Design an enzyme around this catalytic site. Structure first.
Site, PDB file in Angstrom:
ATOM      1  N   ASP A 181       0.852  -1.215   0.000  1.00  0.00           N
ATOM      2  CA  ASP A 181       0.000   0.000   0.000  1.00  0.00           C
ATOM      3  C   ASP A 181       0.882   1.257   0.000  1.00  0.00           C
ATOM      4  OD1 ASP A 181      -2.432  -1.337  -0.083  1.00  0.00           O
ATOM      5  OD2 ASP A 181      -3.212  -0.508   1.790  1.00  0.00           O
ATOM      6  N   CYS A 215      -2.225   0.197 -13.596  1.00  0.00           N
ATOM      7  CA  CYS A 215      -2.277   0.253 -12.128  1.00  0.00           C
ATOM      8  C   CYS A 215      -3.472   1.144 -11.797  1.00  0.00           C
ATOM      9  CB  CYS A 215      -0.928   0.718 -11.568  1.00  0.00           C
ATOM     10  SG  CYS A 215      -0.161   2.130 -12.434  1.00  0.00           S
ATOM     11  N   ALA A 217      -3.334   4.913 -11.811  1.00  0.00           N
ATOM     12  CA  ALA A 217      -3.186   6.008 -12.815  1.00  0.00           C
ATOM     13  C   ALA A 217      -2.567   5.517 -14.128  1.00  0.00           C
ATOM     14  CB  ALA A 217      -2.363   7.148 -12.219  1.00  0.00           C
ATOM     15  N   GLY A 218      -1.897   4.369 -14.136  1.00  0.00           N
ATOM     16  CA  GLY A 218      -1.233   3.864 -15.356  1.00  0.00           C
ATOM     17  C   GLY A 218       0.094   4.581 -15.661  1.00  0.00           C
ATOM     18  N   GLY A 220       2.851   4.863 -12.656  1.00  0.00           N
ATOM     19  CA  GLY A 220       3.878   4.552 -11.633  1.00  0.00           C
ATOM     20  C   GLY A 220       4.377   3.116 -11.690  1.00  0.00           C
ATOM     21  N   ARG A 221       3.658   2.193 -11.042  1.00  0.00           N
ATOM     22  CA  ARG A 221       3.937   0.725 -11.173  1.00  0.00           C
ATOM     23  C   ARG A 221       3.989   0.312 -12.654  1.00  0.00           C
ATOM     24  NH1 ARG A 221      -0.383  -1.192  -6.457  1.00  0.00           N
ATOM     25  NH2 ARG A 221       0.216   0.456  -4.959  1.00  0.00           N
ATOM     26  N   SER A 222       3.047   0.762 -13.469  1.00  0.00           N
ATOM     27  CA  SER A 222       2.984   0.455 -14.912  1.00  0.00           C
ATOM     28  C   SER A 222       4.293   0.880 -15.605  1.00  0.00           C
ATOM     29  CB  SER A 222       1.774   1.158 -15.543  1.00  0.00           C
ATOM     30  OG  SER A 222       0.533   0.632 -15.081  1.00  0.00           O
ATOM     31  N   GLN A 262       6.707   7.605 -10.656  1.00  0.00           N
ATOM     32  CA  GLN A 262       6.006   8.701  -9.911  1.00  0.00           C
ATOM     33  C   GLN A 262       6.839   9.202  -8.715  1.00  0.00           C
ATOM     34  OE1 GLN A 262       1.959   6.642  -9.362  1.00  0.00           O
ATOM     35  NE2 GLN A 262       1.287   8.755  -9.603  1.00  0.00           N
TER      36      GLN A 262
END
Ligand SMILES: NC(=O)NOCc1ccccc1
Ligand SMILES: NC(=O)NOCc1ccccc1
Ligand SMILES: NC(=O)NOCc1ccccc1
EC number: 3.1.3.48
Length: 284
Positions: A181, A215, A217-218, A220-222, A262
């Site tokens: 998280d 993810c 917002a598409g 950060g992780r993405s 991000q």
């Protein structure tokens, strides 16, 4: 410059925040006029995250062709990715329309439906075999075929049917379920394992349309997922793998979608994943 030592040079100096801000300063700025039209306000999860006009995915309909999705085309690596936001209650039908129109084989999901007690994306796939989903707005049907639940990720087989033509395709859903998280994973081991499972499936390969990655917002992780994949592919391909400059790959990708990576912690995690992923392939 070899990135392990550079990595060690940034870590010892504690300059992650300073490197990350230099990237933000040099990143491309292109117009996003379609994303900001008033008719599209309920098609965007976040007011500050929009696809550029030049690289946006168009839906094949005359009514409204807009979705918050971008085509990232990496010319030297010979890979393409679609990066998109977590679908909204009113964009679940658009999402599956895009998967159909672009001939994607795989969907990669890097978030949970609920995180920090809030909804991060819609429940956009069926949870039981015998309870299929129909989207009347885009005339499609989606059925769960099978589910394989592991400790760090789940793989699902789905059937997507074009109710207009009665064609069907198998879509693989790769769901990474253990990103924390807050912050980033401590080890990149389970993230690299996941990436190698997506590759093994054929989902990233040129005989299919681009993989769909999201993810919340598409970006950060993405961003982490496509930066790690492209960097390791370039190290496989080039005569001198030390030439591969992760900051330069990230700026090229940022020509196609804003904001990829991000935080300074996500930038450091991206370095760790590529280094370890390189070390595991390059010998020991
Ligand atoms: N069978 C069926 O009509 N399912 O509804 C799909 C759906 C719509 C909005 C949000 C999440 C899922
Ligand atoms: N609303 C609309 O017109 N959608 O067109 C997309 C679409 C739907 C079903 C089968 C193939 C494409
Ligand atoms: N897989 C591959 O490309 N191997 O050759 C590159 C390499 C690996 C280990 C040590 C030095 C170079």
């Amino acid at each position: 410059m070899e990135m392990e030592k550079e990595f060690e040079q940034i870590d010892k100096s504690g300059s992650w925040a300073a490197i990350y801000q230099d990237i933000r300063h040099e990143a491309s700025d292109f117009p996003s006029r379609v994303a900001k039209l008033p008719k599209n306000k309920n098609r965007n999860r976040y007011r500050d995250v929009s696809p550029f006009d030049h690289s946006r995915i168009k839906l094949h309909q005359e009514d409204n062709d807009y979705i918050n999705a971008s085509l990232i085309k990496m010319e030297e690596a010979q890979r393409s990715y679609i990066l998109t936001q977590g679908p909204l209650p009113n964009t679940v039908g658009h999402f599956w329309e895009m998967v159909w129109e672009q001939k994607s084989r795989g969907v990669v999901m890097l978030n949970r439906v609920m995180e920090k007690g809030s909804l991060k994306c819609a429940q956009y796939w069926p949870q039981k075999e015998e309870k299929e989903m129909i989207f009347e707005d885009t005339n499609l049907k989606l059925t769960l075929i099978s589910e394989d639940i592991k400790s760090y990720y789940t793989v699902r087989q789905l059937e997507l049917e074009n109710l207009t033509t009665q064609e069907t395709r198998e879509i693989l859903h790769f769901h990474y379920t253990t990103w924390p998280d807050f912050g980033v994973p401590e080890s990149p081991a389970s993230f690299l394992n996941f990436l190698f499972k997506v590759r093994e499936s054929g989902s990233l390969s040129p005989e299919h349309g681009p993989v769909v990655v999201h993810c919340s917002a598409g970006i950060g992780r993405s961003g982490t997922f496509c930066l790690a994949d492209t960097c390791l592919l370039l190290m496989d391909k080039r005569k001198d793998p030390s030439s591969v400059d992760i900051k330069k790959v990230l700026l090229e990708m940022r020509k196609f979608r804003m904001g990829l990576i991000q935080t300074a912690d996500q930038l450091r995690f991206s370095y760790l994943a590529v280094i370890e992923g390189a070390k595991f392939i390059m010998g020991d």
